[PDB]
Design a protein around this ligand. Sequence first.
Ligand SMILES: O=C(COc1ccccc1)Nc1ccccc1O
Lengths: 172, 171
Amino acid sequence: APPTLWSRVTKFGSGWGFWVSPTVFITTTHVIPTSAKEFFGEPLTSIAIHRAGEFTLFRFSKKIRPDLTGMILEEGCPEGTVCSVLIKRDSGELLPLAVRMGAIASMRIQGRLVHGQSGMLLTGANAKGMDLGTIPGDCGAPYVYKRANDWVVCGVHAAATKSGNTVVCAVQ
Amino acid sequence: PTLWSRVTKFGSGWGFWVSPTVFITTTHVIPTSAKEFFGEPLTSIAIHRAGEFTLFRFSKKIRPDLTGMILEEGCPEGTVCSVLIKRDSGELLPLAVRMGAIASMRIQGRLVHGQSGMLLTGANAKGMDLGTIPGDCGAPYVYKRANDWVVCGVHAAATKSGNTVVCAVQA
Ligand SMILES: O=C(COc1ccccc1)Nc1ccccc1O
């Protein structure tokens, strides 16, 4: 995936979030610190927070990331699209895990009720563990794919099954 | 403790530490002018070559941090392997590959002997985090069997469409 998409992935709470533009940051609701009253040096009162289940969007009154261009955010992707999940791991290692996307789904994953776009990892037979699959610390990592001449972001990492084969992306 | 630490830049591609003393790679990526590898004189290294598969056995522990892994001569047909690709970008690309028969295959005009495979990404490039490139040669083919990881060969060749790959195997 291009260097400018990796530059948008920010360590945040117990996982990650993604800069769509200089003023828009998206993440998974459950990684947000529940006591937090300030983000990137800005008070809550100067932020527009839009939460739909496990999808949260922050819109800032000022340009936090002026090095960035605004890119397209869509509400999931067509069934069958192959996406990359942009996962950062220990010591500047970059893991763009390939996932074939499926239908909008509701699941029970480790007792928790999760809703979003389901997908199947294309990394191995069974992706149990950190070498071929996701870990809980990956929540908030973006789902991206390339169209003709450009890249789209279509959601953020919310959950994975105990086998590791099935993932859920939270969508706007 | 990670499989990824075993994948090492080597020659014109990569190789893989099976154990503290055993390193496998693709024959064509190996330097043809050398007096040492990983600081050990070639004097003290056993080299076993079979077609596009090469195994190095060192006389001392180069990677004492590692346990020994199972190395086998390919895998059953229908096994879904992962090819553990490292890129000079810093990206790690594990790609699912459905494995087929051992054969001599014509790959972009040359004959390559090894185990055929097809990527589960299938479609195309369009963000080459979905297929292989020439600099990937020597990347290992692994799969999980019960509690155990198995390595069953090294990346030797791929077709232009990138659907078909060849895993060079021991013996
Ligand atoms: O403003 C920031 C970082 O935090 C600060 C620093 C100084 C004063 C106020 C806030 N930008 C930034 C850079 C890289 C990634 C995400 C970011 O928000």
